[PDB]
Amino acid sequence: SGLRKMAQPSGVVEPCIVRVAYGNNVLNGLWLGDEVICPRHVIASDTSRVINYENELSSVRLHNFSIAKNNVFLGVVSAKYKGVNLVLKVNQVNPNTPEHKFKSVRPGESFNILACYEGCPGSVYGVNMRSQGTIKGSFIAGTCGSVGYVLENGTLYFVYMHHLELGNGSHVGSNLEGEMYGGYEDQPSMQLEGTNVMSSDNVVAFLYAALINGERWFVTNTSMTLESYNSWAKTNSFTEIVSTDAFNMLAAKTGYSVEKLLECIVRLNKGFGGRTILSYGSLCDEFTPIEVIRQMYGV
Amino acid sequence: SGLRKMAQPSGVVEPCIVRVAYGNNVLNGLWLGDEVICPRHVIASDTSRVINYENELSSVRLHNFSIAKNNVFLGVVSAKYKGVNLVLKVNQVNPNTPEHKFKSVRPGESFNILACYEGCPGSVYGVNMRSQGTIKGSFIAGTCGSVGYVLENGTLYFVYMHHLELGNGSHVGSNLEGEMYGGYEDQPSMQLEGTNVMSSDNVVAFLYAALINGERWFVTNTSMTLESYNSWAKTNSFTEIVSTDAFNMLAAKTGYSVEKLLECIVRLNKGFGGRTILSYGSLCDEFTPIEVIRQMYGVNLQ
Ligand SMILES: *[C@@H](O)[C@H](C[C@@H]1CCNC1=O)NC(=O)[C@H](CC(C)C)NC(=O)OCc1ccccc1
């Protein structure tokens, strides 16, 4: 038993990380085949300043890139943008390129961050995409280019690359197509996040986790229809529930329908009365249904 | 800029995990060289009752082990107990054996758990050893043999192997010499966890982390001596502070002495009661000062 926020093992990703420096900027790249992908602000001459990305590209000196994986030195052959990323062709194919694909994560979905410090993998932890396209992680100077990934059905997907932090502390990256999650710009000027909407799917998963862990104090055989829950959700900053299917296994094992747990949400959102659930003091939307299934049942 | 409980990368460990099956039991082994280490209850006929490990080992037949990882089949050459672990010699050397050492972790120290499910590494997460030898993780059937490790100054240390779960949900394992942390037995009979003692050093580190993150509702310009704080800590289940040297740089960057945070600890222990710190609802002792420094400043990564 027990519930902890987890990362999928990082081993297949770690050999793809390279250090990328240009000028005084130093961040991380993803080396696959003969291509390195990194955040394009590595070529900005002053990141404290609105960047004319287009003059920075047209005046780039390819030899002023410094790219290395331990004592493998990579030279840049060509450089272009793909959205908010630089796509650099390099002079050597990564011999440890794993089979992989690209996709985007959606709000509510969890994924893994390999946090890299100026080219060196340092830590790995799980996160969850919020409704405004941000994650709450732990990033500082030198960590841009840190990559997010997921392992599904035996295949590796790259889903995230880190670019910046908002004034409220939220963290903002792109997919590997160069599209910034949430639509934010890769510029130093002020950028605000809209209201956060809690993932109802994830909070249901959380309460199922609590029931599986033997913690049932909050639950009741009273239930609420999807429709009533969804009318309440819209006026309480919770997502609407589109279908119960993702919960079929949790409901089968526990014997609790989704609809009884929807009644729990509406009630518990008014407060826990100084009790806890899985040691949290308020509803937690950080665990997806599959995250719970993996941890509680091992599949 | 955020604080999250983190693990160091797992790549050097993943290739060392194998499935170990005997009878109806399935768990994980640590394959290094031509040696597999795994919890000895893999061989037990019935883990729901107390076990005579010495007698069961005498009836074991080495061809009844199945040890495997993907396209690797390992046959067992010999077996013996070292503490609560089986040490098996197998017929092939692990070609991806990392350089490594064994050591023990102590209370308040952090390390990494690679959770492994019937031979498949499934997840990695950081933990912190509690005063009674336990960790608060997530472990289920099939995850015994899961390994704990720490990377310090370029050296991979193996520090933990998983064995069991106490009645209160606390998780218990051994070091890699087969000594169980906290002295619990590898038996199904109920054993109690003593009282938990919070690590004061880690709580101070957590409060420093909050301050760096711009969260300071809880702090004042009032302090408490070490001797006063240690007197309190003895009677409120907190460790005593031996010295403030580990916090010099943290103290220099925030402007707050350890002694100010000590007063915060005594005050905040009665309750946050409605506010939060770095989204936590009560004092948290799961981060060491070095863990904090890594995340705030990105240096001492081992
Ligand atoms: C990596 O290049 C860096 C990651 C930031 C640094 C602090 N926490 C992060 O996630 N990205 C930036 O510095 C980014 C630069 C481009 C958007 C031009 N700027 C940024 O994030 O400014 C906000 C900020 C900077 C430094 C500390 C706290 C917030």
Ligand SMILES: *[C@@H](O)[C@H](C[C@@H]1CCNC1=O)NC(=O)[C@H](CC(C)C)NC(=O)OCc1ccccc1
């Ligand atoms: C690994 O084989 C397994 C891991 C336990 C099982 C549940 N959570 C864990 O950490 N270890 C055992 O099953 C162990 C058997 C030996 C000590 C003989 N028994 C155990 O931990 O009993 C307590 C328990 C069993 C099942 C569910 C919850 C607690």
